[PDB]
């Protein structure tokens, strides 16, 4: 029982793969509670090696994802692979583990899928396994900076919200894109772009922070950078130039369900970067105070930010407070905090984390965001302000 949770890994590229440089670590620090037991990759040659470089003692490597899906040694499987192969992958996992009955958990990353209905589906599906907990990687939620704001507010430190203002950066939808960057990231049809991911990530944490969902909203999407600069490995740019069909900027406003609190948010696509302002900020106007979060990298999900707040200690005598946590490895720290939420509940099914302070978010959550994101999309397109108050309901 009090016996590691054995992770099966889909997307373990090698010793220097994304997940290698993030999840892997998340599970060292939890060696006590998690064990990596299986690695799927489509060439055995590659699993074996990853196991080598990393010395995964308990790992055994797979060639088939059916092959995988079956190992009645995996209580929980992680899926961290391109989102366009997110639908493919997952689903099979699902249908090809029905017999496996210690698989109790299936983790996946934001964006759950690459199209709502495509994830809608993966959702509709997830649903049947009486015995399954799903998990979306909205590491946004676990950030000392986020939780902290969230606690500040909740306790009436800043009163009732008034206004909210935002800012972000996609990174690579700038006037500059990097040598190594995946063309797909930029294939319109990818299902990967600013909103979807970056913003999706962002906004959600806000709906998360405030802890109120949206009621109605408006969105507008721009494409004025139709060709970009290529960067040599060092970042020095190069006379060479490339095509984007994923958008360069999006504007969005909406009225928060709770309070009719209004929200302003302008998301830049990349470079050049704002130089007279933080490229990442959340400006919350409270009634007894203010709370601002600021990053130079709009990747809150991954970023170590800083939090300034001001207002009443408790919730007339207002106070200032600066919350920044020097050298905290958000990059990895953050996933780690989601693995604990999981361990917690396990060594200690759920529906969605929602607005709850413990637990972790689910495909329910993955979905609601997803759902809401189509909105954004439909909204710009339709050139109308839509009501996103049923987003949170299903059957």
């Amino acid at each position: 029982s009090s016996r590691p949770i054995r992770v099966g890994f889909v997307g373990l590229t090698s010793g220097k793969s994304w997940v290698a440089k993030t999840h892997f670590l998340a599970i060292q620090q939890l060696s006590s509670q998690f064990q990596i037991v299986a690695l799927y990759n489509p060439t055995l040659k590659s699993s074996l090696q990853t196991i080598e470089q990393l010395q995964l003692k308990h790992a055994t490597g797979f060639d088939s994802l059916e092959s995988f899906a079956q190992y009645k040694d995996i209580d929980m499987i992680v899926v961290s692979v391109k989102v366009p192969e997110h639908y493919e992958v997952v689903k099979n996992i699902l249908e090809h583990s029905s017999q496996n009955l210690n698989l109790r958990y299936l983790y996946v990353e934001w964006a759950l899928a690459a199209s709502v209905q495509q994830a809608e589906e993966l959702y509709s599906i997830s649903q049947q396994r009486a015995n399954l907990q799903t998990i979306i990687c909205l590491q946004g939620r676990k950030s000392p900076y986020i939780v902290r704001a969230k606690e500040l507010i909740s306790e009436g430190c800043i009163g009732d919200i008034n206004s909210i203002e935002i800012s972000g950066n996609g990174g690579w939808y700038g006037y500059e894109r990097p040598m190594r960057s995946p063309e797909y990231l930029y294939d319109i049809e990818s299902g990967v772009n600013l909103i979807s991911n970056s913003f999706g990530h962002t906004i959600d944490v806000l709906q998360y922070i405030t802890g109120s969902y949206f009621q109605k909203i408006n969105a507008m999407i721009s494409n004025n950078i139709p060709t970009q600069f290529l960067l040599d490995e060092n970042g020095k740019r190069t006379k060479e130039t490339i095509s984007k069909t994923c958008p360069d900027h999006l504007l969005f406003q909406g009225i928060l369900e709770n309070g009719k609190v209004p929200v302003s948010c302008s998301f830049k696509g990349g470079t050049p970067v704002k130089k007279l302002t933080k490229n990442l900020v959340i400006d919350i106007h409270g009634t007894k105070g203010d709370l601002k979060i600021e990053g130079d990298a709009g990747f809150v999900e991954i970023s170590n930010l800083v939090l300034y707040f001001y207002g009443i200690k408790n919730g007339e005598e207002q106070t200032m407070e600066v919350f920044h946590l020097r050298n905290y490895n958000s990059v990895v720290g953050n996933i780690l905090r989601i693995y604990e939420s999981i361990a917690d509940y396990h060594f200690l099914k759920f529906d969605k984390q929602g607005f709850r302070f413990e637990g972790f978010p689910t495909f329910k959550d993955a979905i609601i965001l997803h759902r809401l994101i189509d909105a954004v999309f439909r909204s710009d397109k339709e050139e109308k302000t839509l009501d996103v108050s049923k987003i949170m309901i299903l059957e």
Partner: peptide
């Protein structure tokens, strides 16, 4: 002093 996350970094890890 605040060691915040710089995109430049971000680029490295990613």
């Amino acid at each position: 002093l605040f060691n915040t996350t710089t995109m430049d970094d971000v680029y490295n890890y990613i």
